[model samples]
Target: ESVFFLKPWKHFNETSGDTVCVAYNPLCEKFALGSTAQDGAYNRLGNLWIGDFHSETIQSLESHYKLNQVGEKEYSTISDLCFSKGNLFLYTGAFDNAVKVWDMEGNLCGIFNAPTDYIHKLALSDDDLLAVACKNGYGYLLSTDNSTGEILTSANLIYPEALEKGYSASLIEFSNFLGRSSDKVIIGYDSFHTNRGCLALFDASTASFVQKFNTADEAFTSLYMHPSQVGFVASSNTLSNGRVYYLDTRMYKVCLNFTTTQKDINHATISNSGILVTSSGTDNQTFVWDSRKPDKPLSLLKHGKTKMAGINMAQWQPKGNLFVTGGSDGIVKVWDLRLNNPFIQNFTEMNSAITYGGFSEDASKLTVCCVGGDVNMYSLGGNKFGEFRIIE
Candidate 1:
C-alpha cells in the first residue's frame, strides 16, 4: 500500500542557484539538466550538465567539449529542457530569445532564434517538427531538417480582451500524441496585470487557429496535455478554483471543466489510459480525478504540510501506476495508487523547491528538477505497481 524511496542522490549544482529543465536519455543511460545563470563576470551565462545515476555515489558528467571555454557565448534563463528521438539531441528554451539544440555528447547542434519574443517551451513532433512557444502570441513550427532550421509555419494566438490591453504569451505545447491522425498545438496566454488568460488551439496541418477558450478571470501558471488524451490541465495563481477540461475542437466546446480547491493547482498528469487525472497545488495537496467523469476528483492525497506551502510539480510514471511528488522542502514523495497516502522515499539537499519532473520513455527512472538550481535522479527499483501500467 505504500511506496518508499530507495535512494536519494544529488547529481549537479554547476549553476549554483539558477537551475532549470531536467530530462533523461535512456539510450545513453544518463540524465541531463540545464541552468540559467550569470557568474557576475559574464551576464546571462548558461550551461548544461549531464549525469549518470546508475551508481550510488552519483557523478556529474563532464562534456568532452567545454561550452564555457569558448569565448563570448551567453545564454539567458532556460525555461524548459527535453530530449527527443532517443539520445540524439537535447532541446533548451533560453531567455536570450532562442532555442539551443545540443548533442548527447554536449556538442552544440543547432541554434534557433525566435521570430517572436523569448522562447518559453519547446516540444518535438514526429517526423522532425519542433514546436517553439514564445513570450509573444506567436508559435512557430520549425522543421528539424537543420539545413536551415526553416520555419515552416507561424501562428499568432489571440490574447484575451482584458489582457489585450497589454500582455504577452507565456507558454505553449504541441500535441504529444505522436503518430495520431493529425498534429495540433496549444498555447496558454497569461497577463498578470490584466488578470486574464486564454487558451488557443492551432491546426498543425493548416497552421491556423482552430479554436480559442477564454477563462472568466484568471491567468494560467502551468499547462499540460495528456500524452494520449483529448483533455488538458490549466492552473493559475489568480483563481482559487483551478480548472481542467477536455477539449474537442470539432464540437467547438470546452466539453469538460473540473474545479479544484487545491490552492492554485500548478501541475497535473493523466493516467496512461487517460481515464484518471492527477494534479498538485500550492496547498501541498495532490488530487486524483476520474477523468471518465470530469465533474469531480475520485480521491485526494495529502503529502504532509511543508514550509514551501505547495507541491510545485508531480508526475506519474509513463508505464507504471506510481507517481512522485516534489515539494518546496526538497523532499521527493512517491505514491502507489493502491494507498490512500504517499510515502516519502527520497530527500534531496537542493531544498530550493521542485518545479517539474517526468519519467523516461522506459519508466526505468524518475527525474525531478528543482527551482533552487539542481536536479535529482532516482531509479524505479522494480515494477511494484505494474497493474496500472496500462489501464484498460
Candidate 2:
C-alpha cells in the first residue's frame, strides 16, 4: 500500500480559540485570519491577524492609527473576509453590523454598515463593487472608489421578484464570464414563498435585477461557480430530501438537478470547469458525480473509521481534476480525479475537523480553517523523499 505524508509549508496556530475564518491574497502571498479568542488569549475583540508568509512575519491587523469603539455591543471581531482582485484592498466583516475596508498595510479605509444584521459573507468584484450578506435576511451591494476606499453607491437587495429575501444569503459571489467579472452578482437567497428559495443575478453597475431562477424548495445552502462554463453548482439544505442543482447562468436555467443521499448535505461544490460535482452530506460520504449523469456517483470518498467522522468541506483546485477535502476526523486529503489512484496526498497534522477553506487562485497555496482553532497554510513544496520517511 502507498503511504501519504504531507505538512504545511507555513502554519498559523496563533489563535487561542476557534479560528473562525481565513482568506488568501495570492497576488501578494499574504493572508488574513480571524478567531473567537478573547482578551489575554491573543486576540482582542476588534483586531484581526494578517501575515505575508512569502516575506515577513505574521502581524496583528487593525486600523493602525485612528480608533473607535462603538460601545461593547458594537465592539467587533472578524466573521468573514476577502481580498480584492489585485490584493489592493482587504474587506472584513465582523460581529457588528459592518464591513471594514483596509489597505494592505492595515489602514482602515471605509466602513459600510448594514441597517440591522451581523455580516455573514463578503464578495468583491474586480470593478470595485462589494456584495455583502448579513444575518437579518438582508443583502447589500456597495460600489466603491477603489483608490480611496470610498463607497460611491449602496443598493438594497430584497430580491425584486420575491419583493423580499433572506438571510444573509446562503451564497453571494461575483459571476466570472471570461474576463468580464463585475457585470453580475450571483446571490442564493430564500424567496420566502412556498418554503422555497431562488438564485438571482443582479447588475452591479446599474443596481438592477437582471435575472432570477426559482431554485430548491428548501433553503438555498451553498453555491460553487464554474467560471469557464459560466454556471454554478448550488445546494439546498435539508435533512430528508436533499438536492443539488447545476445552473448555467448564461442560459438562466438549471442544467442538472442531482440527488444527495435523500438525507442531508453539508456542502456542495463543482469542479473548475463544471464537468464534475462533489456533494458532502450527512451520509458520512462525499460523492462525486458527472454533470450529465446523476443516477450514480462516480466515486465515494471516505475519511476515517469512526461512524461520526464526516467531511466538512471540499474544494477543487483552479486547474485540472485535482481537489482537496477536510474531514471531521481532522484530516485534509488531496485527490486527483483523473488518476488511477485518485487519493494522492494527505495532511494529518490538525486533529480538529476541517471547517472551511479552498485553494488560492493559482492553486499554489491553500488556506484551511479547522475546528481546533487553527488556520493552516499548505503549499506544494519540500523534498519528496526526505519529507516522507517510509515506515516498516
Candidate 3:
C-alpha cells in the first residue's frame, strides 16, 4: 500500500459516544453526520451535524440537529446514512421499535415505527419505494414521491418458509427498475447460526418471497446489488478471508448458480465503472473488481500502519477516481484509483477511532464518522469543478 498524509485538519468534540453515520450532500456542498448519544442526563437522542471542508479543516456550518424526542422518547444509535434524490436520510435501530426519517436540511419528516421489531436497515427504492428491515420478524415496503416526499402505498412483509429463519432481516436493496411498474426487492439476513447467511428476493407487487438462498457460512456482514446487472456481492466473516458470492437475484430457483470466492470481503460498493470490495480483520486490504467481469478483479490495494484490525467501511466517490476507507484504528485514508499510487491522504488525528466515511455526490467534500461520538469533514484539496468538488 502507498502512504500519504495531510496536515491535521479539524476535529469536533461535543459528545462522548461513537459516531453512527457519515454522509456528504453535494447540492448544498455540505457534509452531514449523525451520532447516537445520551440526550441529557437521562434520555438518548439522535443527533445530526452538517459542515464544510475548507482551508484544510472541517468547519461547522450548523450546530448539531436533534431529532424530536416525541413518542417513545428513548433514542437508538444510527446504523446507516444515505442520500437519495436530494434528500438526506438516516437509519437508526433502537429499543424504541421505529426508524425515523429526517430531511437534508434537518427536519423530521415522519417515523416508520414498527410494532413488534426495531428496524435495522433501510434503503430508498428507486424514487418511489422505501424498504425497511426489522429486527423482530419482517420488513416493509412503502411508496413515496421524489418531488414531494409523500408516501403512496405501504406493505408489511412476511417471508416465506424457505426464506424465514430465527433472526430478522438486517439489510435490503431495491432493484434498479423497482418502481417503474414492476415491483422487486432484495433482502439480506445475518444469521444466528454458523455460516447460515440468507438472501431472498421479494415481489413488491405481492409482498411475497419469490426465492431465497442460504449461504455455506454463518457470518454475513453486508451485501450490495450491481447497479445495472442482476448480480450482487455478499461479505461474510470477521476474518479478512470473507467470501464474496456472485449471485443472480433474478433467478427464481432456490439456489444460486455461479459464485466467485474473495478473501477478506468486508464492505462492497458498485460504481458505474467497477465494484470495490474492502477486506477487514488483520488483512486490511481493498480490492476493486469490475462488475463487467466479476470472475476477476481489475485492481487490488492494501493499507495499514500498525496492528489495525479490519476496515469498517469503504465508499466510492460518486463521480471520480477517489474513494475513502475507515478502520478499527480510527484512521481514514483516501484512495485514487487512477493514480499508480493511490493513498492521497491519511486523516488519523481524532478524539477516537473512525468506523465509517464517504463523499457527497459531487465528491467535492468528504465526511468521516468516528467511534468517539463525532464526525469530521475535509475539503477536496487539488481541483474543483461541477456543483460540488471532485477528489481526482
Candidate 4:
C-alpha cells in the first residue's frame, strides 16, 4: 500500500460559524469559503472569505445594497458557491433569496433575487448562463453579461409548468451533448406524494423544457453529468435502499441501475474517464464502480465503525487519479483508485465534522472545510506543502 504523511500548510478561522462549503478557482489559483451560523445563534449573517493562493491574509466579500429591497434587514446564510471558468467572477447562493456575483478582487458586481427565500444550488453554464435551483420546486435560468457583470432578468427561463405542482429541485447540471455545440441543463427533484423522483431536460439557449426522464420509485438526492458522453448519473435515497442510475440523455432511458447501498446515497461523482464513486449517508461506506461493469463495485471503503456516521461528500481530483472524501466522523481520506488498498493518505485529527473537501485544479493542494469554522489547506507534495504558482 502506498502511504504519505499530511501536514497542515495553513489554517483560516475568520468566520463566526461553521464553514459549510469551499471552492477553488482553477485559473486564478485562489479559493473561497462559505460559512453558516452556529447552533442557537441568531446571527444568521453568513460570511464569505476569499484568499490568494499563497497569501496569509484573506478578504471578506462585500454586500451590494442595490440588490436588496429598501429596509430589508434580515440576516442570511450562504448555501453554496462556485467560480467562473475564467476566474473572472464568483457566484454565491444565499438563504436571503438572492444570488450574488463578485469580481476576482472581492468587489460585489451584481445580484439576482430569486422568487423564493431559499436557493438550494447554483450552477454555471459554458455560455455565461446561471442556473438557480430553488426549494420551491422551480428552477430559473439567467443569462449573465460577463462584460458588465450584469444579470439580464428579462431573459430568465422558467421550469416547465407541468412540473410546477410537485417536488422541489435538489440539484442542477449543465452539459454539452456529444453532437450539439450548445449546452443543455438537467434538473433533479425530490419525491412528492406519488412521484418517486424526476429528471427533466431544458435547452439552455431558449430556456425551453425538452423532455423528462422517468425515474424508478425513489427520490433523487444527487446528479452528475458525464465529462464526454451524452449521458448523466443520478442517485436516489429510497426508503428500502439507495440506487444509482446512469441515463443516456439522447435515448432518454436508463442504461444502468446500481443498487448496492443499504442506506441513502448522499453524493455521487464521476471521473473524467467515466469512473463512478458513490457515498451513502447511513452506511458509513464509499463504493467505487466501473462504468464498464456497473453490476458490482470494484472496491469499497468504510469510514467509521459507528452505525450512522457516514460520508457526506466525495469528489475526484480535476485531472488526477486521487479522490477525497469527507465524513460525519470528522475525518477526511484520500484514496488512489488504481490501488486495491484504497488508502493513500488521511487526516483523522480534525475535531469537527467535515462538510466539504476539494482539490486545486493543478492537483497540488487540497482544502477541507469543517463544522468548527476551520478551513485547512494541505499540500499534496513532499514533506511540506507546495506553494501556489501563477500561470501566465
Candidate 5:
C-alpha cells in the first residue's frame, strides 16, 4: 500500500490568547504549552499548560504558579520551552528575560536570569550547563544544581576578545547543544556593528568559548542540531534575502550555503535522513532542501492565506520521514518527502494562528498549538477525520 489513513486521537482548545511555544518531553509521554491567553485577571500574565500526551485532559500550569512578591501573577509570553536533562524538569524561556525550571507537577524549582529582554532559545547540555540565548548580543551559560534544579553560577558567553574591541554581537537569537555525548553548544548571533552574523561554539563543561563561523551578511536567526548527525547543524538568518547554511563543526571549512526564497526564517530544522526544512515569515512559505544536494527546495508549501500567513514552524518527525508545518494562517499541513506530489493532508485549522508544534519522538502522535489558544493531538491509524499517512 502507498499510504494509510490516520486521525485526531484527542484535542483540547484554549480560548486565552496566542500560544507562542509547545514542546514534548524527550520521552514524548508529556507536553508543555505556553500562551498569552489569560482570564483577564491582573495576577497571571500568560497561560502555561502541561498534559499527559496520552490523556484527554490538559492541566493548567498557570494555576499552580505562585503569585510574585508584588502580588502580581503572570506567565508572560514564553519565547522558548525545553525539557531538562533526563526529562526531570521543564525549562521555559519567556519575554520577561528569564529561564525557569519547573518540576513535572508545575512547582518552580529554579530561575536563570539573562541580561536582556526576550530570551529566545534554551539548550541544556548532557551535564550541569544550560545554554541560554538572550535577545541581547550574548549567549549565557549557567551551571545550576542539576540534581534539585537549583540556580548556580553563570557567565556571559561572548567572544572573549570582543569586549575590548567593541565588535561583539547584538542578539543571541538561537543556541543548540550539539550531539548526544559531546559538551559542545553553538549560538547564532548578529553583530551590532556589521550586517554579518557569527555562530560560536563553546564547551559546556570547561566553560570555554572555542570555535566560530561567520556569515557573509545577514544576522543569524535560528539553528538546530541535526537529528542524527553528530557534528552538523543547520543555521539560518534574518533574511530579507537569505540562505541556509549547513555546517560541520568538525570539518570547519566544509559548509554548504543554499540560497532560497524563504525570508525571515522562523524555524530551522533538519531531518534524520539529512533533508533540511525552514519556515519563513515574510515569504509565507515552507522550504525543504536536500542537504546532500544543495539547490532549490524539493518542495515549496504555502499556507495560502494572504494576510500574515507566514509559516511559523516546520519540523521533521523525529523517527519518520514525514514533516509537519504550522502557520500564522492557522493551518497545519503534513507532507511525505517520498512522493512527487508530497503534501499528504491539511487539518481543518483553528480560528487563530498556529504558533508552534511537532510530532512525538515516536512519530505516532502529532501535536500543534494555536494563537487562539488551542492544542491538537493527532495519531496514526485512525478512521475518523484529519489524515496522516506514512510511506515506508
Candidate 6:
C-alpha cells in the first residue's frame, strides 16, 4: 500500500541465456550474476557476470574450459553463488559437480568437487563454515580457511534416518547465532521414495544430524532461517496451491501453517523484523505475513492488473525496511514495509521473467537478473534510511 518512485541507476546485458542466480559483495561493492546455457546457441556453456557498484562496470567469466585435454562440453551452469564471511572470496556452484571459488578480482582460487552432479544451494555461516546441498539427497559441510582460501575439512551432512531415507537436499541455511563455534545448520529436503517433505537440523561440529521433522506431501521448495530469531520458515507447493510454515527450531514444533496461494510458492524471504514475504508460481501476487499473527498475512501486494504471471523471487534489503520482488511479467517491484501501502516502486526494463533479485549489503543498490539474460542495477537514491529492525 506504500507509494514511492524507484530510479534506475544502471543496467547490464550479461548473458544470452537465463540469468538464474545473483550475489552481492558489500566489502568491494561488487555483485555477480550467473546464467544457464542459451537454447539453440552454439555455445552451450554458461556465463558469470560481475559488476562493481563503484566503477559502474560489468565483466563476464567464460564457463567453457578444457580439463586434462578433455573435449569441450558445457561444463557448468552457475546454480548458486555466495560470498565468504569476510567477502574475501566468491563461491559458485554448478551442475558440474563442483563448487568453484574466485578471488575479488574474478580469478579462480580453489575448487571443491561434490559427490553429486548438481549442487542445489550454497550457504556460508558467519563462522566460515560452508554448507553445500546437492541433488543426490545429501549435504556437505566444509570448514574453510578464509585466509588461505582452502577447505580445512569436509563431512557428509547425513543424519542416520535421512541417509537411510535417501532424501534430496533442496535447501541449506546456517544459523546466525553470535559465536563462531556454533555448528548449527538447517536443511529442507524432499523424499521421492516416501513422497514427503522434511526439515532437519545438522550439527557441523559433530558431522551428524541433530533432529528432523516431516512436512506435507508437497516437497519444500525453499527454506529460510530468521536473521535474528530462533525459528525458521518453509514453503511448499502442490499442483494448485502453496503453503507457508513457521517452525520453532528450538522447540522442534510448528508455530504456524499458512495456506493462501492458489499456485506453487516459488520463493519466500523474511525481513529483519520477522515480516515474511512469499511469491507464487502461477499468479502475480506477493503475501506479506507478520510472524506475530500467523493466522493470515498482514498485507497482499499485487500487480496493477489481473491475469499476470506469478512472482519468481523476493528479497529484503539487508540494511533498510525495503524489499524487492521479481515476477514473470518481467517486473521488479520495491516495497517499503514501514508504510501502510507497501508498493513504493516498480522497475520494468526487461520484458522477461525475473529469475533472481537482491539488494547489496548496504542497501544502497539493487541487482536483478532475468530469464532473458538481463542483469539490471538500480540505486536506492536518497530513500535509503534507518537500520534494519530485528524481529523480537
Taken over the whole model, the C-alpha lDDT of each candidate is 0.59, 0.66, 0.55, 0.69, 0.63, 0.69
Estimate, for each residue in 114-198, the C-alpha lDDT of model 3 and write its tens digit. 4465566777654536787776648788665455444456787767552355656777877643333465777777654434556
Candidate 4 lDDT tens digits, 1-392: 11133456776665657777777886647788887744344342337777776555577775321223445443456778888766788888877677888887777777886546477787877665788887677778876666666776634445554355567776888877664756777888774454365677778778878777766546788887776756778888777778888887667678877887457677777766675655456566788788788778878876765322467658776665667787877777778777769787665446676766766656666777777666777764344433332221
Q: Which regions in candidate 1 have their CA more than 4 angstroms from the true location? A: 1-10, 26-30, 38-46, 51-75, 146-165, 176-178, 214-217, 237-240, 248-252, 292-297, 305-309, 338-352, 380-392
Cα-based TM-score, every candidate: 0.77, 0.83, 0.71, 0.84, 0.80, 0.84
Q: lDDT per residue, candidate 5, 161-231, as tens digits?
A: 44443333433322332543455667666555544566666666666787666565456666766655443
Question: Clashes in model 4: which pairs?
Answer: none
- What's the C-alpha lDDT at position 64 in model 1? 17
TM-score of 2: 0.83
Q: Cα RMSD (Å) between model 6 and the true structure?
A: 6.3
Model 5 scores what on Cα lDDT?
0.63
Q: Which window of 10 residues has the lowest lDDT sum in candidate 4?
A: 383-392
Number of backbone collisions per candidate: 3, 1, 14, 0, 9, 5
- In terms of TM-score, which candidate is stronger, 3 or 6? 6
Instruction: Tell me how far the alpha carbon of residue 311 in candidate 4 is from the true structure, in angstroms, after superposition.
Output: 1.0
Q: Which of the predicted structures, 2 or 5, would earn the higher lDDT when compared with the native?
A: 2
Give, for candidate 2, the lowest lDDT window spanning 10 residues. 383-392
Q: Ten-residue segment with the worst summed lDDT in candidate 3? A: 383-392
Query: Residue 137 of candidate 1: its Cα lDDT?
Result: 53
